[PDB]
Design a protein around this ligand. Sequence first.
Ligand SMILES: *[C@@H]1O[C@H](CO)[C@@H](O[C@@H]2O[C@H](CO)[C@@H](O)[C@H](O)[C@H]2NC(C)=O)[C@H](O)[C@H]1NC(C)=O
Ligand SMILES: *[C@@H]1O[C@H](CO)[C@@H](O[C@@H]2O[C@H](CO)[C@@H](O)[C@H](O)[C@H]2NC(C)=O)[C@H](O)[C@H]1NC(C)=O
Ligand SMILES: *[C@@H]1O[C@H](CO)[C@@H](O[C@@H]2O[C@H](CO)[C@@H](O)[C@H](O)[C@H]2NC(C)=O)[C@H](O)[C@H]1NC(C)=O
Ligand SMILES: *[C@@H]1O[C@H](CO)[C@@H](O[C@@H]2O[C@H](CO)[C@@H](O)[C@H](O)[C@H]2NC(C)=O)[C@H](O)[C@H]1NC(C)=O
Ligand SMILES: *[C@@H]1O[C@H](CO)[C@@H](O)[C@H](O)[C@H]1NC(C)=O
Lengths: 109, 49
Amino acid sequence: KRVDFCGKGYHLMSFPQSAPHGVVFLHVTYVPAQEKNFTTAPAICHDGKAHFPREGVFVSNGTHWFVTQRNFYEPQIITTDNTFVSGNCDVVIGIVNNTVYDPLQPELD
Amino acid sequence: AGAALQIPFAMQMAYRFNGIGVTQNVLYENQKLIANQFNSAIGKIQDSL
Ligand SMILES: *[C@@H]1O[C@H](CO)[C@@H](O[C@@H]2O[C@H](CO)[C@@H](O)[C@H](O)[C@H]2NC(C)=O)[C@H](O)[C@H]1NC(C)=O
Ligand SMILES: *[C@@H]1O[C@H](CO)[C@@H](O[C@@H]2O[C@H](CO)[C@@H](O)[C@H](O)[C@H]2NC(C)=O)[C@H](O)[C@H]1NC(C)=O
Ligand SMILES: *[C@@H]1O[C@H](CO)[C@@H](O[C@@H]2O[C@H](CO)[C@@H](O)[C@H](O)[C@H]2NC(C)=O)[C@H](O)[C@H]1NC(C)=O
Ligand SMILES: *[C@@H]1O[C@H](CO)[C@@H](O[C@@H]2O[C@H](CO)[C@@H](O)[C@H](O)[C@H]2NC(C)=O)[C@H](O)[C@H]1NC(C)=O
Ligand SMILES: *[C@@H]1O[C@H](CO)[C@@H](O)[C@H](O)[C@H]1NC(C)=O
């Protein structure tokens, strides 16, 4: 996890080869590509409660809000298993209104 | 690690709080105090210099 100790990018793995009086390291790394821009927010307010992502960031495609993982764009809908709650929505700078979906009660019809 | 991708600075500070074991609500609920403390700490360096 040391930055730039094993090449440029996120180190995946490395292979050694012998040279005359030396060694050659072939570093395999992961390099992110083809980014898009989005709107973002730190928390989400629902029922007077602030919701934070468990892992990921809240992003908006223009009209809807999703959670994604931070390094590869893979959007999902914001549920109570995606997030955790802390406090009320009066203290966070930049909080946004949206609905956080519960699975249990629409299972219970 | 590649191309520069923008992110707002308080959200970068929250990632970094996660990286030491503190949840990020602890940053967002203290943002103003944390920024005051950083500013006083930076203002103390030029005084010693
Ligand atoms: C943002 O993504 C959503 C996808 O959830 C698009 O909204 C539509 O949402 C309904 C119900 O959620 C789906 O049945 C549709 O298939 C979605 N797409 C369309 C084209 O109707 C929404 O269009 C996206 N917004 C932008 C600006 O890209
Ligand atoms: C990001 O910065 C913009 C300014 O560029 C903020 O927008 C202003 O919001 C205030 C309310 O606090 C309004 O009175 C101003 O009229 C807005 N200005 C513009 C140019 O839109 C925005 O609130 C900031 N975002 C956050 C999360 O603080
Ligand atoms: C997000 O939703 C909340 C919930 O209603 C909004 O809070 C209201 O804000 C208006 C204007 O600031 C007040 O007149 C109401 O009294 C508030 N309602 C409650 C129940 O407190 C909040 O304004 C919404 N945020 C945005 C940006 O529209
Ligand atoms: C955590 O520590 C900080 C000290 O940096 C406290 O904030 C200070 O509180 C004193 C009260 O004695 C104020 O006079 C200062 O102005 C505060 N500093 C800043 C930068 O706001 C804070 O109260 C402490 N929190 C708790 C829960 O004890
Ligand atoms: C994102 O938008 C900015 C302008 O706000 C633009 O300069 C940048 O090239 C865009 N990047 C992508 C991936 O769309």
